[PDB]
Amino acid sequence: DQICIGYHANNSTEQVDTIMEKNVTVTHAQDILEKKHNGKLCDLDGVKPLILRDCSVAGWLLGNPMCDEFINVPEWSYIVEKANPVNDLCYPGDFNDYEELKHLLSRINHFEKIQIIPKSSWSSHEASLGVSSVCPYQGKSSFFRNVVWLIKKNSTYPTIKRSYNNTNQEDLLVLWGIHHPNDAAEQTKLYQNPTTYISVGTSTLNQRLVPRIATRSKVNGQSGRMEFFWTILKPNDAINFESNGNFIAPEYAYKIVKKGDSTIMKSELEYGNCNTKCQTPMGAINSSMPFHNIHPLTIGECPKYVKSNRLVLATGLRNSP
Amino acid sequence: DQICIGYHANNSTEQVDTIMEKNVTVTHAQDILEKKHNGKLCDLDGVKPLILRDCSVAGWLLGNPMCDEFINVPEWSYIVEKANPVNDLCYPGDFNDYEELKHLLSRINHFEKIQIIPKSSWSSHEASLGVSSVCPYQGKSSFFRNVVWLIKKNSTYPTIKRSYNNTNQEDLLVLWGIHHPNDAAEQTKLYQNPTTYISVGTSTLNQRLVPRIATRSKVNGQSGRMEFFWTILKPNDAINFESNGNFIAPEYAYKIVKKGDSTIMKSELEYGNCNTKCQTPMGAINSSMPFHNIHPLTIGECPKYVKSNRLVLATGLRNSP
Amino acid sequence: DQICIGYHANNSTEQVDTIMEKNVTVTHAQDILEKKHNGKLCDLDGVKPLILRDCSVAGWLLGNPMCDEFINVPEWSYIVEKANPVNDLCYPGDFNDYEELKHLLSRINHFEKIQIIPKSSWSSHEASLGVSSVCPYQGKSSFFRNVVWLIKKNSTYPTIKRSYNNTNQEDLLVLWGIHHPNDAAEQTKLYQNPTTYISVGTSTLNQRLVPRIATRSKVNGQSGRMEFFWTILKPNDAINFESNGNFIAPEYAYKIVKKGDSTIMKSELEYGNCNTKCQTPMGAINSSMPFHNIHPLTIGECPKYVKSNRLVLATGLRNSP
Amino acid sequence: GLFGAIAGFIEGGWQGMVDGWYGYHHSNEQGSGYAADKESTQKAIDGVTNKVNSIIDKMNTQFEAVGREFNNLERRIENLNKKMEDGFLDVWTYNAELLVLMENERTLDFHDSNVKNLYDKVRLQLRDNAKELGNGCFEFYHKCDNECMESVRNGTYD
Amino acid sequence: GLFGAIAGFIEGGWQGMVDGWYGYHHSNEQGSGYAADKESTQKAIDGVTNKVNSIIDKMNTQFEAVGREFNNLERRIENLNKKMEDGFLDVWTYNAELLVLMENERTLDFHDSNVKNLYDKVRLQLRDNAKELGNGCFEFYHKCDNECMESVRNGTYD
Amino acid sequence: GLFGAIAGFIEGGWQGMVDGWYGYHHSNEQGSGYAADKESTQKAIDGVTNKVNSIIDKMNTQFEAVGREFNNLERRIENLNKKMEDGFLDVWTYNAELLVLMENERTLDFHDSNVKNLYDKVRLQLRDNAKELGNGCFEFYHKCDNECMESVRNGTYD
Ligand SMILES: *[C@@H]1O[C@H](CO)[C@@H](O)[C@H](O)[C@H]1NC(C)=O
Ligand SMILES: *[C@@H]1O[C@H](CO)[C@@H](O)[C@H](O)[C@H]1NC(C)=O
Ligand SMILES: *[C@@H]1O[C@H](CO)[C@@H](O)[C@H](O)[C@H]1NC(C)=O
Ligand SMILES: *[C@@H]1O[C@H](CO)[C@@H](O)[C@H](O)[C@H]1NC(C)=O
Ligand SMILES: *[C@@H]1O[C@H](CO)[C@@H](O)[C@H](O)[C@H]1NC(C)=O
Ligand SMILES: *[C@@H]1O[C@H](CO)[C@@H](O)[C@H](O)[C@H]1NC(C)=O
């Protein structure tokens, strides 16, 4: 007669690492690293992302005519942008403080587009002629839909003095521009006046832009250059425009209705018709693991990102042959 | 007859956590996290802070007339500034490279204010008239005490050519400004000349400021704008001023006598009449704990900040019922 | 008759630390921290560094006449620069975006210098006279060898309109400058025209430089100022220069042949005639230790830097007296 | 393992003990079988469950990357931003991999310890009344039926 | 605990031993009482004192936050600065919380170990001359007065 | 140490055992000497070798400093860059110093454990047939020549 003390073995094949020994087979284990995703872009808690497709954030906000899908966009959860969007800045140029603007957007979920200066508000200047073939809409010469390229009327550019007051509770993103012609002839041709300026004033902004007229490389068959500026107009503040030519003028501006947690994620993926609690640029995650190794840049209720290939905890004991 | 081996218990109620078990009662323990502070701003090793109160660093250095408490300040240990100081920049404007200046200050303990260009040094221009009602002193129109708002004399603004040499051993902080009027009439009214410039030269600085004259929102009943610039004038170097109007000119400058470890801390607290070895924005710390969880931004002989609510080491053994 | 269980002792003096006890003598140990270096600058895998000596990166690229050792330099592995190089910018000035340029260099191993605009290409302007005594070569007034200080010919400065196309596959670093005279007389003297501009155009660059003419301190007996600009000209793009004076013009530009991992290290050391797999600013490292405590900034197959004085692992057991 | 029981003096585990993590095998005239020791098994289950929860909790405040853009002439700050984000992800990856490695070893040893403590508990009861076999087993000197056997298991004997 | 003595085979501690951390209780014709074992107590005191000092020292070089300001159009760098300062404070908070957690468990086990080692030291002396009771106690076969009792305590017996 | 054997019940090591880390000393009519126990020594060698390799590997992805320059009016970002690079070098220095400290203690205890397990293996064989001396030694009751001695060493006895 005999009594013995002993411990459990089973048919487990599960392995864990230690400091002194790799691949110990254990009776029980708990994997804590999520290695799988669904490979799609999905809604975040019901709320669909803004998927730009072939349009850049610049192309969207300025209203590139190739970006009409985004004339009026609903509240989003995050924004998706391709690494190199083709439809950006159809007329060549720069977008001043572009990355600081993008940064504001990562903390915004909704815009509401409102008209601030009506196109049929210009009596002394030609609005309807500021169009290029580099910005085509339906086979015809067109232009950024939210700004108005003002040209001389009956060979005259009177000094513009226009002003907008913010009678919205909300903050308002205002965008304008300046055209840099490539020679003295073009300046005469479009604006009449040789020496011009655009001056912008708010309670915190003291701007005076002057056209830089020089010969430069053609970009998409164009030597001219557009340079776009922006400001956030506080509620109850007024923006004061004054220019005698080269002025690309506000028509539409954006009301910042909702501030929400958001990002601009870089992804070549298109919409996947799914819902998720956790989105990466490569696919969505559904799991109750503490960690995952999909991608660092997530949004939602997400596991923590590690660079591991494997994270497995022992729970049971060393399993015997 | 019997002998037994055993261990200590006592009436301890002290608890420690482990990986496998929370709240183990131990016979002895050592708490290592300081959770308490005295809630006051105090001197640091005898040396009183510079407590700005309602004045901002700009308001102090330019000498806003509401900031007279700080005409001549003794060596400090750190500086305290409120989150939103009311007395800053009484005449609306900007302070150029303001944060890079603030950054220099965090490595400075003492200024000594010296006169570089005397107000009664201007023969060809009116000094005593450059004053606004937005900068009041004792019910009267006044102005930043350290800079001189020069105006035309007998309807003339001769070109200014003034120069200062640094015959101090020390580095010297020099401050100047430019006025941006809101129309052509004001330019004529104050400076006579339509088209002006301020030009500043040192051995490393090549500056030319030009007034940006545009219509903009009233701020504290003012449409004009002041824009202040600064440089650190090395010992034995000379600053060369040259202007034909809009020049806000140096009267006083600051000698940088002492470089010491310091910070500008943000705090709404006022002076507490205490001494301490360790100051946080919320109160001072006196302890021999290795850690504390008061606030990250301390100055002095301080424990290390952690975000914990509780850090307790076991020393004794598991205490029995 | 007796059998005993026991363990090894030896004459080891090797000591390791633990949490509860410092300086435990162990029978065997493994030191894992490299504390030694050879104190020289060496080649990295056969490939010699670019050792600037008394020349700064600016002095090298602009071709300061004191930097002739570097007219044509072979592919390097890293670059070495002293903390305060004496031969930098012989004619006083600034180098615009200098640190962003230095940053490009840390990812470049080879330049090939090519002539873009020939000095004997200027028919209407005097090239051979733009020289200063502050930039001497062999006792005579000289100048940066890679840029041409253009002066008026027969009392005239015609508008320059010159353009370069990149018919190299490679990226090309292009450098130019502008001269800021110290008075109206010098402007007349050198360039004839009172009011000048330099305008630079590529497909992405829209530049217009204007001379800032003011009185300022002498630096190395000079009141004038040079300000140098740069761009990376993409292959198949053209740079468009246009100026009517103050133009310091490209003669030579750099072809970026090879992109390699590199750094600009700061070191007062000169060449040591050695080879190594791992270089620090203080000396080279040859070891199979995992860690070292020499200096943080290494290049090559290097151990990881820690701030420790001592890292020793126990392997054997506690050694007895 | 540190405590010498698991895959040490007790050569291997028991497929036939499906019941719990540690227990007894008995063998006498009436028959033989396995019985899990539920107290030490449950104690083991609680410890490992808290460890997993402690590990998960302690890691709920790791670094989260934020998307952040820079233009062509902000390369120094872009790189700074890169090396900063990667730097933290490396610190946390190391933190997580090592915590798992060290704790995995602690867990294996804990099981060993529990087996040894249970072995010793039985050894201290039996004393002289049985031959300690050297292999996890005790051979009784006087016949020990099921109720005697149950008696060792619950901690009453003699 | 790992070593099976504290709140294991020795069921509970002694309120009546005020004297040190580990020791003996004895009981005979002349009376009974407690005596701390000073060597192992002091050894225990040194280890724990060095651990605390090691822990404090190793942490004296944590990250210190520096105040740092940014204007309205430097939001990317302000945020970078924020996430950098918070990132380190999180790394150090985790470092500190875990070091305490892991070391607390090591300390408890160390005490257990010391109790077991002291138990075994006495067991190895007594050998046959006493019945090992199973509970931390040894019942002597031949009468053992105070000097005999003192004899076990100092490590001389028989 | 935790397991009570090294510099505990076995008072000191053996200069005369050049052969391995743990083993036996025997002593009888024919003579006396040392014999390393190769199985547990090799087991010990493998564990420590893997630990060193694990430690080295886990650390191969530490933070690398990059040279980075800033002009006179970029002092905020220069300082940010400084405190960021130093911050990581401090995290890694602490990581490395503590890993070594904690693991050094684990290694010492592992050796102790191995010595105790080997002691117990022999104790479980000898049983009654020898007096346990209290010092790492077993004194035999019936004469034990070299082949009997070899018999304890390989794990066959009686
Ligand atoms: C064990 O493994 C075998 C084969 O993989 C499988 O049939 C069985 O379901 C597993 N679990 C049990 C209870 O044996
Ligand atoms: C451990 O097992 C895995 C199988 O998944 C194998 O790839 C790996 O090489 C093994 N490692 C060692 C060191 O045995
Ligand atoms: C223990 O606790 C009791 C009640 O809290 C208290 O009276 C006593 O002073 C404490 N210390 C001692 C020595 O008992
Ligand atoms: C531990 O005890 C504290 C009392 O301070 C209590 O708040 C906490 O919930 C307890 N934690 C657990 C898990 O028992
Ligand atoms: C041990 O130390 C002594 C003296 O340092 C030395 O002679 C010997 O070579 C070392 N190694 C051995 C095998 O004793
Ligand atoms: C450990 O020994 C070293 C000798 O290298 C000595 O400098 C140090 O002070 C000692 N530390 C302690 C605490 O004993």
Residue numbers in the entry:
A (entry chain E), B (entry chain E), C (entry chain E): 5 to 325
D (entry chain F), E (entry chain F), F (entry chain F): 1 to 158
From the paper:
However, a prerequisite for efficient transmission of avian viruses between humans is a change from preferential recognition by the virus hemagglutinin (HA) of α2-3-sialyl-galactose-terminating host cell receptors, predominant in avian respiratory and gastrointestinal epithelia, to those terminating in α2-6-sialyl-galactose, which predominate in the human upper respiratory tract. Thus to better understand the nature and significance of such adaptive changes, it is essential to monitor HA changes that may affect receptor specificity of avian influenza viruses, particularly during human infection. A single amino acid difference was observed in the HA of each egg-grown virus: Asp186Glu in A/Vietnam/CL1/2004, Val134Ala in A/Vietnam/CL105/2005, and Phe151Leu in A/Vietnam/CL2009C/2005 (H5 numbering). The effects of the single amino acid substitutions in the HA on receptor binding were also studied by X-ray crystallography of HAs in complex with pentasaccharides possessing terminal sialic acid (Sia) linked to galactose (Gal) by either α2-3 (LSTa) or α2-6 (LSTc) linkage.
Introduction of a more bulky Val134 side-chain in the mutant, in place of the highly conserved Ala134 in wild type HA, increases the width of the hydrophobic channel between the 130- and 220-loops that form the front and left edges of the receptor-binding site. As a consequence, the H-bond between Gln222 and Ser132 is not formed in the mutant. In the Ala134Val mutant–LSTc complex, only Sia-1 was detected, suggesting slightly weaker binding of the human receptor analog (LSTc), than to the wild type HA. The crystallographic structure of the HA–receptor complexes provided an explanation for the poor receptor binding by the Ala134Val mutant HA, namely that distortion of the binding site by the bulkier valine residue would potentially cause a reduction in the strength of H-bonds between receptor and binding site. The consequent increased width of the site is more akin to that of human H3 (and H9) viruses with their preference for α2-6-sialyl receptors. Detailed analyses of the binding properties of the recombinant viruses containing the Ala134Val substitution, observed in virus isolated from a fatal case of H5N1 infection after 4 days of illness, showed consistently that binding to α2-3-sialyl sequences was reduced, but with no detectable increase in binding to the repertoire of α2-6-sialyl sequences examined. In contrast, there was little discernible effect on agglutination of guinea pig RBCs by the Ala134Val substitution despite weak binding to the α2-6-sialyl sequences included in this study. Repeated identification of the Ala134Val substitution in clade 1 human H5N1 isolates, but not in contemporary clade 1 viruses isolated from birds, emphasizes its potential significance in human infection.
